[PDB]
Amino acid sequence: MKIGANYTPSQGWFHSWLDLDIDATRRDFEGIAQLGLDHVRLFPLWPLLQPNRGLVRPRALDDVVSVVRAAGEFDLEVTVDALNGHLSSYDFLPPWVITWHTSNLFTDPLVKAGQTDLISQLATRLREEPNATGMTVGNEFPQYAALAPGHHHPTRSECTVDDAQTWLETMLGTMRDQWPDGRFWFGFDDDLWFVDDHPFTPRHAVTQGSATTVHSWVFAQVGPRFGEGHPALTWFPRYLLELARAWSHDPERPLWLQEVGAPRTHVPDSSSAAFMTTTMASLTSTPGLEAITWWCSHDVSRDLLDFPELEYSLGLFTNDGKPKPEALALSDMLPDLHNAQPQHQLDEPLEFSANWDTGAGRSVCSPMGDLFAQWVDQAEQTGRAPRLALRP
Amino acid sequence: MKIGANYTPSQGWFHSWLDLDIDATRRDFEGIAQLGLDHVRLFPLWPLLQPNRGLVRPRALDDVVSVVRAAGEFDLEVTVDALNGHLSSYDFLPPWVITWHTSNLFTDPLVKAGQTDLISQLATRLREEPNATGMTVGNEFPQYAALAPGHHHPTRSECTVDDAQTWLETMLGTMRDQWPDGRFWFGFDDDLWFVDDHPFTPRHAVTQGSATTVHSWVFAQVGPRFGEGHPALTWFPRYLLELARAWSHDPERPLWLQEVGAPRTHVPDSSSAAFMTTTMASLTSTPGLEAITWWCSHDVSRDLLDFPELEYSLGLFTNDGKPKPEALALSDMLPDLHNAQPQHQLDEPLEFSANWDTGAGRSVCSPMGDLFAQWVDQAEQTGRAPRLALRPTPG
Question: Is A387 part of any domain?
Fold first, then answer.
């Protein structure tokens, strides 16, 4: 199994793209490579790549490639998220899609034409770099359709289920057309798993792109319900992956745990190492799991304001570049993770019913319901991750 | 009076701040100064200056100073709009003020603290350039409070009349604290003159900052009502300036026609020279008028998409730098404009009733109303710009 990090530049965070300092980048990647990690996930900014729909900036693309080549110096494999878009509570949107220029980020024909232009130019650059493996359409881009009572986007783009599929096929198809050897994905917060009317569905997750992705974040629901120190905190990503496996009709469908982390809302600094060890140990046996990518590489500088406070301390390194206790715990897990001892599950899968075409009824799997509490209870008592099963 | 241009970079428009090519900037400013123009208005981009509330980028400030000094090489006076903010239908907003981070651009205490920080660092840099004269708060920044039926901002910030005053006093106060020798202004679209419940009022306009500013655009209302070729199109800026004079209780209050232009919705290319000369002739006698600034210096490149189409052709120059017919017409008017022969107006001012404290009733002055129609009628009949007079309503 591959083990890597979501790259959050220590100097400048993603605002570093405006004043790119490749030697500072190299010091970040040296640290990541020193831990034993083998890949990073990169996040270029949409307003810098494409400040007007007809202006895809060549120097912005040059900057992306410089960072790709810096990672290659330290033998780090790279994937790039194309449309960011959304990062750590902030939306990076070019002026031609906001306020007076509002349209629909999933169905407006000119917006889609701009998105495919940017994605095509990115893919044409990235296919030439030997350590670049592929692209994700954008970081949790489906949140621009979020409509849940506790998480609904303030300038939401209306979108049907079929609209969502057509948008994915357009973006992923453009990547494939320009970069046939690449692998391509989309990623999303867990509204896709848990919100019945969310237009991006589990069907989309297990059928579009090269692997099913999961982002696993316990601070919104799992932590509030179950609390600090509870086992559900460390079983959550395995649960999400078993849910992804339950939804798939293909036993060969690979999985990528593209985001997982330890929010200090419910995992104190002094529990972080143990959280890293317990979480990682419960993932090694996951069938089909190709990679785990930690959020994030480096603490966000406290000189940057207005983040939700949990975002600042998600790094494996402090902002000054010092490895944190969970960083060393991760290095120790790398042999077990690389080898990934399969365990063939002979359990009785916990069943749930939910609609394939529409995603209706998927809220039965929510961390607030009985099914997840029962899953965690059985995983703790047996020590073995239960399978899940979607009634046919 | 002074005559200048709102600077719209030919190579890349305002997106040129990301890839600043000072030799391209020199080429634009050379054309502007060759015409006889003596100043420019500059628009730095808020997301570039302050991508995070805690990060005012010194390299972005350096780039602003570089353009100020490039204009000094052609003896061009400079003012800088601090918070942009709004430019030609586009909003340039840092991520920390939008969507999940939405607050209030006029009343949120942390937003204001961020705004004053940026304004202070800008003022501190600009006060050391000899050709920099002052700053405007931001281009038409009150449009973030717009609430009119035909013009309401889709993510508007709720704001009272007193909120508006407090915000201006905070921003303008910061500029004066850091740059005592400077002159400072705010500018606005004509909602301030014409929309009864717009929280920025004519009272604010004639009392805050160093001079009353006017932006004069005929495409939204004057053109549609009166049509191509009508005299109302060329009288409109003088009307607005006489309205500004009427609201002011101070005869010494200066005026700045900070934006005026010739939109092709109602002024064809082949009418632009005549529009320029007629408009400018009706302005030379305006009491207190210190400067006129044309929107804009250079046509927007058609390689840039999704602009309202009228925005592309507002330049004095084509995008590749050829002077347009109105540019040469303006160059001829320059002796008459520098000399600015005053005229004592001995007329009976046309009266209107509106509220000084709240701005209520100011819509009687709208280009859709009878007052503006009679003003134009009398101006055409006599050849003299009529004065206006405010009768303050009780409350």
Answer: no
